[PDB]
Amino acid sequence: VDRSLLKLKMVQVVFRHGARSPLKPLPLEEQVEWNPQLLEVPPQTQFDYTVTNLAGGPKPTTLKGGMFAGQLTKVGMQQMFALGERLRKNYVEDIPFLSPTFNPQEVFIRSTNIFRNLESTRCLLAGLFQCQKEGPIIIHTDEADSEVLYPNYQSCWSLRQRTRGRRQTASLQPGISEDLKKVKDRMGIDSSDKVDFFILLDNVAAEQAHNLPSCPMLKRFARMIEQRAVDTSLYILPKEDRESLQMAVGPFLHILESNLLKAMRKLYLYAAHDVTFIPLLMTLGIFDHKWPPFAVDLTMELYQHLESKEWFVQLYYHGKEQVPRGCPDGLCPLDMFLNAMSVYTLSPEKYHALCS
């Protein structure tokens, strides 16, 4: 189709928080030091916000070195800022789709209620709007028990049940087991369980992102660690199991879809997690078999053709053009896109029904 004839209607972004300290420190005798000066907020990122419920509405440990676990750092803040700036290039500079200043009317913001995602959202907005707002910044969040921004095992009974055996046996799978044993052995950490590939990956990725001197045997195995984390995660929620993927990412897809249809707000922002991205990318047919990186984004553009009145979407992941289920390279007709993803989508009512 002829791009000059297309008008940008809506943009949706799903993103992961930036570089941060690990959630749980590894059981190591010698540990890397995390300097609190990494928590310094660069002035270009300082944007104040209010957290609310979905309405809304009233809102719903220490590492060596004196820094808290799972905390976005100055490094992560700069990544998220950079993400904001790329969006500004496309939706502010290249075309005047969004006002250069934050407008509550133009933008809807949602995040899981966890500090690292809230601060990442703050930094993204700071870059996108260059710290300029025409009104209060509201970040909408839901209570953990209702949250759909990650697969919710606690609140969805059937999902917990369907994955139970695979959750148990994921780490005993061929090649995963032998490799976990190899790493722990070499690290001198073995028998420390529970330490699985997710905890190893969490640590190596956080240290690498910060240029910190990881344990050498941990670094030796960094690639295997990421790969096996991915294989573990895929084994638990395989492409072949439709109902599980539905209960895992279905409601979130339903939200994304609903936004497209309403557009038939300029921008929707969703701060999500790596465990959200893996199944989301798989249902979209775009998974690259890599652990979703810090600050990674999934961007959706919705256009309408001025002559024909037809609607098209373009999908990007990590700045790269993607081809989803049901779509040709380039602009994908909205019906083709939505019809393909309909297999994975779950209305809130069907979701609630399926979960019990």
Strands 267-272 and 6-16: what pairing? Answer: parallel
Assigned token pair, 158? 């059937």
Q: How many CB atoms lie within 10 A of CB 157?
A: 13
- Dihedral (CA of 230, 234, 239, 240) sign: positive
326, 336 in Cβ contact below 8 A? Answer: yes
Chain centroid to CA 146: 18
92, 125 in Cβ contact below 8 A? Answer: no
Resolution of this entry, Å: 2.2
Q: Tokens 């002559």 label which residue?
A: 307
Domain count, the chain: 1
- In eight-state DSSP terms, residue 225 is H
49, 137 in Cβ contact below 8 A? Answer: yes
Q: Which of 94, 274, 288, 352 is catalytic?
A: 274
Please report, in angstroms and rounded to a whole number, the separation of the first and last CA atoms in the chain.
45
What's the CA gap between 203 and 294, in Å, rounded?
13
Rounded (to 5) percent helix, strand, coil in the chain? 45, 15, 40
185 among known catalytic residues: no
24, 202 in Cβ contact below 8 A? Answer: yes
189, 12 in Cβ contact below 8 A? Answer: no
49, 139 in Cβ contact below 8 A? Answer: yes
Amino acid at position 130, single letter:
Q
148, 158 in Cβ contact below 8 A? Answer: no
User: Domain of 118: which CATH number?
Assistant: 3.40.50.1240
What's the CA gap between 82 and 43, in Å, rounded?
14
What's the CA gap between 121 and 345, in Å, rounded?
26
216, 223 in Cβ contact below 8 A? Answer: no
41, 77 in Cβ contact below 8 A? Answer: yes
> Among candidates 327, 323, 277, which has minimal Cα distance to 298?
277
What's the angle, vertex CA 247, arms to CA 199 and CA 270, rounded to 5?
Answer: 70
Range of the domain at 222: 1-356
Q: Which of 17, 140, 210, 254 is catalytic?
A: 17
- Dihedral (CA of 213, 219, 223, 226) sign: negative
Helices (H) and strands (E) in the chain, counts: 12, 11
329 among known catalytic residues: no
